[model samples]
Target: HWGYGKHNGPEHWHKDFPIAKGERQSPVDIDTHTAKYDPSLKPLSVSYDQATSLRILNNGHAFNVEFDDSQDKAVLKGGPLDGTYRLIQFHFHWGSLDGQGSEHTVDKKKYAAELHLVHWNTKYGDFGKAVQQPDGLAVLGIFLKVGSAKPGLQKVVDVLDSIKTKGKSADFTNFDPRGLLPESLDYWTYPGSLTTPPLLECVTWIVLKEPISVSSEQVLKFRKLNFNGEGEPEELMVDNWRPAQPLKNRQIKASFK
Candidate 1:
């Protein structure tokens, strides 16, 4: 009963999933002045084995690149997380327009797009199970700024055509996600919930300060995505991002001084 549409959009999600109105909801605006600079916070440690990239799928919601997390092949350590977390999948949220697609905003400003690389703590076994706990997930949020063409992102864009319609699946492999990241490891951290259904307050959000570059045309290419599968008339899959939520009593922490 939830989508980005006015009928069953984020505002109406609370009708079924009460957690949508919870204190720790995600996609909050990052106010730098109020953010605490925690020197004690360690740098994020990430290891993603390119070979572990299994497949890509159009889940009707977004295009997701899945990873094999059966082992420590792609694990996230340090950076506000106390234990190891395994990378399960990565997805994007965007708008039909250029300057307002990102879910998490900085200083009340939005970017062209946003990337969410989702992970779950191994302490709770697997992602499906861990998502029910308080400290279950760790989501890395990367802002995508549109400008010069990003050659590093061509690999991901190449597969978008094959999986443009919902339920479409494609064999994707041997791609390193590390090259998609920005030069600086600096970020802001806070406690929040998943931006979608269930809206469980289980994520420890880590949003990078610097945005990676993608061409204006490249950003628009994602607008070609369709919500319906093969047989149905195409419905554009644009403006799939959730609006920023209230901060409430949460404190945003910065990794750099």
Candidate 2:
């Protein structure tokens, strides 16, 4: 288990996961002035059924809101993706502090947190098979800012108490994941890998430009989560974001100029 504590943090991830230093790594710092504006990038189209949300789990690393991807009830198309990407699971990355936890930064500024909505290309059959190929995954990243509490996010925040411990899960149904997104679909596109171990370079990142708001109190609940289970000694699961990796020779494309 490669936890995000001091000794087992991103600096040490490379020892066990060689792809940690892979060329197309994720969480790159986005400088808008240097980004390329591509008019060819299509408008993002995301559709999700409220019933598609099945359950939520605390996977030690972060709380994952899993969906029923067995069917095409929820899917993402357009915006730098080749085919329809089925919704699987969505999660977040954050820091121990209030304004320093986002995985992908904008113009060198870090946000309060970041949300990942992971979708697998439908052509690859399922998430497991899709994750192995270069164009298999399409992960949409949304930044979180510290401000007014998100009214749409209250349902998710309400369940954190029950799933506070690792490996804990509860039934989470009838929630529309699309409500969590911002009104604008404008985003930065680039090739990258999963932020976690095995660090597969299969994701095409669509990081939104507009950020959503969460209150300071809502942000505090995330830090109180435990890396260990209910009975185990509590270890705060804060600072669970990987550092911004190098852009190398990759070009970042923006949806808007």
> Would you estimate the TM-scores of all the predictions?
0.97, 0.98
lDDT of 1: 0.90
Error of 2 at 123 (Å): 0.6
How well is each residue in 1-257 modelled by candidate 1, as lDDT tens digits? 57888798889989999988899999999998889999899999887753388899998878999999888788888999999989999999998888788999999899989999899999999898889988999999999988987787888888899998989999988868886788887999999999989899999999999999998888878889887798999888888899899899999999987
Model 1 residue pairs with clashes: none
Going through the candidates in order, what is the number of backbone clashes in each?
Answer: 0, 0
lDDT of 2: 0.90
Kindly give the stretch of ten consecutive residues in candidate 1 with the minimal lDDT sum.
45-54
Query: After superposition, which runs of candidate 1 have C-alpha atoms over 4 Å from their true positions?
Result: none
RMSD per candidate (Å) reads 1.1, 1.0
The 0-to-1 C-alpha lDDT of every candidate, in the order given, reads: 0.90, 0.90
Q: Taking the tens digit of each residue's C-alpha lDDT, what string does model 2 give over 41-128?
A: 9999888753388899999999999999888888899999998999899999988887699999998899989999999999999888
Q: Candidate 2, clashing residue pairs?
A: none
